[PDB]
Point group: D2
Chain length 292, copies 4
């Protein structure tokens, strides 16, 4: 039984002033709020119980937007992070939420897409021990935690924001942990940057041969909307997919319905209030179209 | 005389839902800054410093959170609320006491204007002391808008709102200049079948006294309205292209307030500090020591 | 041992005047010529021997661009289509090129991209019987040959450009055939439209229970650059992936090298002439970076 | 009476391999061939007699595309540049074409757009002495000939590709000359770069107080399609204007018709062949819609 966390806080000083009125994760990527995407990633992982962490000031808004989850077959909860002191904090804040269960962490501005991504999630999720993460070839590795591989393609070390990256493989912002993560987090000390580092967590698992690093191929999309230009591109990527296919990406109603977490009657009900527009119309259509 | 401005930034996004489920359209970014900044900037360029921002009761706080009282940019921003999107013309009823006995000007919060000499264009409308001024712009789908009919000499003779059969492809954009007759005109309007108070009815009133001036806004200008997911995309992109080629930014209030001497160098510096770690802040700093024509 | 054909003729009247001076297929999608994309598709299918069909007028230009193929480990050949009389014509024009081998046909303006697309291709290409095609959910199936599924998801019929589509599954423009296709194409009669229809070819296989229709999931991208707008989006989809990953899509030098059809020396030499730009720089970098 | 030259040769080494088969200036920007853009610029300046300069290899195609000009009321001629030895070369190659007339030069991959651009053109074109150029604020002036201003805003010097730009005003690729340009070009010596430099021409005029530098404001768009990314953006810019307005940019048929260089009958005739598509339909529509 794995629980999930979405870490949707952070300042956004960068993308100011665009993000001065509202956290980034509530801004739309093309046609729907950013947080939907990562939300849909956990859903696809088979996770239904989820803790949304954010700034004190934007929780309400997150809640306004997502409610308790029941309408989509979910159980959402909320927690607050007063200061953006490190991904790993998510586990301290989320400790009692997690209890004795396996868990998963995903960044609220991280957008993933691709063929068999669902199976990919499935495999990580279904592991009952250790940790799983993902490595993705990128242009500037140095921004992220970077992984080093030996000659046989096995991961052998990690370095956070190295001056000189040993590879272009970055650790994406999706993480699956077993019951060691809380305690590992509790023993962490702030790095010179001043944060509690997920890399440090990942390393701890790696130092006991329990970290599993799956390469995420160039066929998948891992987009993070870290800059105005990237925010733009992402919105576009999705618009492109959406207008060709006639299907939508990261639409929670659909996933819930496909997973049988809600039934047709429920889906109809969710659609009424959105009937005057594309989105509602899409949901209706889903009730009478087999989509493979 | 002096002119006050209104930015009507309420309205549903019901269309745009669910994107707009968490915040109002007008607070979403067009590329690199909040939408409302654009029309805000339009009024500023019109020489208008005293401005009333109308929005849904629920989003006023967030508008306020973003723009403050205006004093930082040498402006005076007030705020008001529109419980229900009952027509552009309601603005004047809502902003009656804000307007008082001055000339005014209404702009739509999701309307984006850009082009060479747009400043002189504003200047002219703004400096007219009587009557009203609006703008006509060739578009693909005039039927979505209030449409203007012209005689053989290019003089506007009629207006129809959302006609089934448009008499021309010239739409009235969402930027309007009025003298002191607008409030009363607005106070005598009855809702159309759509159920709204129609700015077109307002415009027609002025036209029916030979006091509506309709300036053609040529194809050289951009009038974009971010009405759909796609158009929102295109706009952001339209802006991104100009900005990355020029090294200048569109609709950046700090810059306009400085250029118009509404704030001084010291004030501009101080506005920049908090944003230094990023492009936006860096830009402001750069403006202190570069002559930009 | 399967041979490939790229059909890259066709008029672009629709696309005039943009394509008045040069065939559609030689226009760039973002940073390399459109034909490279489908070219890459066949390469990834394991196909090295390929016939490029085009208008009489533009062949020389296609030749000028791709050469005989030796440089990328291919054997490219050329043929001409005076008139755009149907996809199926490719098999009459290509009859002797094909001889007694398995084959595949891909449209020159069809761009495919996704995770495990290579395995997808592998499976279809290694089949030693019947035909394989792909079905993809789109917004305007009426533009294409549409497939009909029964309640167990098995294909039961096809209709080219139907007034009322039985489903939103369009048959993409990628086709794998066994030795039956030539004789089948030889007995086709022109449809009312005046063309020899691949749908009729697809149907012939279907009528014997030898047509395999694989669903291509929403995780893959099937884009076809059939309108100004879409050509735009496509270019932009590619740029988005390329600028995030630091990898390039459909870059034949790379694919050849990855498949060991050319060696590092060959790759170095291919890059020299392009050294003063990104494309060349990319090639070089491939010689010293492991890319998974 | 001024004559115009469009310089559309050059190497695309940078944009390889995209441009290996055809010259960039024959690729489309969104919905029509690039060269249409500059072509329209000259037309808007009231210039009807034009020399198109290009590689030896692509002239034929340029000619195929644009004809002798008579269909659009122009008089087009052609010449060739075996090697891209500098913008000033256009004047040696174009000497006899120019004879004793005033002239103008525009780059073939330079796209201009804006309100009252036509009047801007008119003013420069009607000057009967000296030279006129335009200065425009850009992000990367070091890529261009840069201009330096005094405290009154008067141009005082030019540097081509300066390590350290004195300003961010670049000299765009649009130039108007009186009868001194040829002889000035005739006495140029190749810079270290190995080209005859238009900046050197512009300086010659500047040294006699006969160079007029007009600032082209941030309201105008000066885009050059010098990189994959910018070629994209440009396409996008245009599509965005076009689909909002229902008017098209740089559509020679229209400009000629507006300037009374062709009459309605001729316009109809030009549209017939393109009737099945947007472009044609647009031309038709122009016959019965007043457009201010
Ligand atoms: C530090 C922190 C960030 N965040 C949010 C804000 C941003 O949206 C986003 C990331 O902040 P950053 O400064 O980019 O985190 P970061 O600089 O730690 O970036 C991380 O990138 C990760 C993907 C890598 O896997 C890590 O190895 C690390 O490189 O997440 C929080 O919500 N809370 C926090 O305490
Ligand atoms: C190798 C390669 C692929 N491609 C294209 C083909 C596909 O559209 C897309 C992804 O290619 P594929 O190889 O089908 O999938 P992939 O590269 O995303 O996935 C690979 O991930 C690797 C880590 C695993 O070891 C492989 O088993 C496979 O899963 O990229 C290129 O354009 N150029 C290339 O050089
Ligand atoms: C009606 C209304 C809209 N708005 C916001 C909603 C959108 O953000 C934007 C426009 O709303 P619409 O329903 O499209 O307005 P509209 O349907 O009144 O369209 C207007 O279009 C103008 C450009 C024309 O000049 C007018 O003639 C008129 O046609 O206005 C409000 O804030 N309050 C309101 O009462
Ligand atoms: C100054 C400024 C302008 N703008 C936008 C407003 C308009 O939409 C667009 C064009 O600016 P305008 O002042 O209308 O025109 P312009 O700045 O393109 O043209 C100017 O060219 C100058 C060199 C001449 O001296 C001036 O007379 C004027 O023509 O600029 C901003 O968004 N922010 C700003 O700070
Ligand atoms: C006429 C025309 C212009 N253009 C380009 C030229 C410029 O880049 C831009 C705008 O054209 P211009 O005519 O320079 O500006 P404009 O058309 O935006 O402005 C005109 O507005 C009119 C209402 C006024 O009556 C005119 O005096 C002038 O102000 O459009 C075309 O691409 N095709 C065309 O057919
Ligand atoms: C007909 C034809 C097209 N072409 C090129 C031109 C276009 O770029 C592209 C397809 O042209 P169209 O006229 O759209 O062909 P088409 O209308 O037959 O389209 C096809 O789509 C495939 C994807 C489906 O599998 C088919 O069932 C079919 O619908 O083919 C040729 O090169 N030669 C030809 O004879
Ligand atoms: C189902 C679904 C997926 N997605 C996302 C998940 C991925 O990013 C991408 C599609 O991912 P997947 O569903 O993992 O892969 P897929 O849908 O491309 O492929 C599927 O093709 C099917 C026919 C096969 O039977 C499955 O085995 C699988 O191959 O879309 C949504 O956003 N909404 C959805 O409702
Ligand atoms: C040099 C040259 C270029 N060209 C074409 C190729 C490109 O499409 C276009 C630009 O060439 P470049 O090598 O970028 O030119 P360039 O590097 O000479 O750039 C010029 O940029 C101008 C705009 C400035 O006004 C000049 O100051 C100068 O900087 O010129 C020719 O057709 N023939 C030639 O001899």
């Amino acid at each position: 039984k794995r629980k999930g966390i979405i870490l949707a806080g952070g300042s956004g000083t960068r993308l100011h002033p665009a993000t001065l009125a509202i956290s980034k994760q509530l801004l739309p990527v093309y046609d729907k709020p950013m947080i939907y995407y990562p939300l849909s990633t956990l859903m696809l992982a088979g996770i239904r119980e989820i803790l949304i962490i954010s700034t004190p000031q934007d929780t309400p808004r997150f809640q306004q937007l997502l409610g308790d989850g029941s309408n989509w077959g979910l159980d959402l909860q909320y927690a607050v992070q007063p200061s953006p002191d490190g991904l790993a904090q998510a586990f301290l804040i989320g400790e009692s939420f997690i209890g004795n269960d396996l868990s998963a962490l995903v960044l609220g501005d991280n957008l993933y897409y691709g063929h068999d991504f669902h199976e990919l999630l499935g495999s990580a999720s279904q592991r009952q021990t250790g940790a799983s993460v993902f490595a993705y070839h990128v242009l500037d590795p140095e921004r992220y935690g970077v992984v080093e591989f030996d000659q046989g393609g096995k991961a052998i070390s990690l370095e956070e924001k190295p001056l000189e990256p040993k590879s272009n493989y970055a650790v994406t912002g999706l993480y699956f942990y077993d019951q060691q993560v809380v305690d590992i987090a509790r023993d962490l000390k702030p790095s010179p940057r001043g944060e509690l580092e997920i890399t440090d967590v990942n390393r701890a698992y790696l130092e006991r041969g329990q970290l599993s690093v799956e390469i995420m191929g160039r066929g998948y999309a891992w987009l993070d909307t870290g800059t105005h230009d990237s925010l733009l591109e992402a919105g576009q990527f999705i618009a492109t997919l959406e207008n060709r296919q006639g299907l939508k990406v990261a639409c929670p109603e659909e996933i819930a319905y496909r997973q049988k977490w809600i039934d047709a009657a429920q889906l109809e009900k969710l659609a009424a209030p959105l009937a005057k527009n594309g989105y509602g119309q899409y949901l209706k259509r889903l009730l009478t179209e087999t989509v493979y």
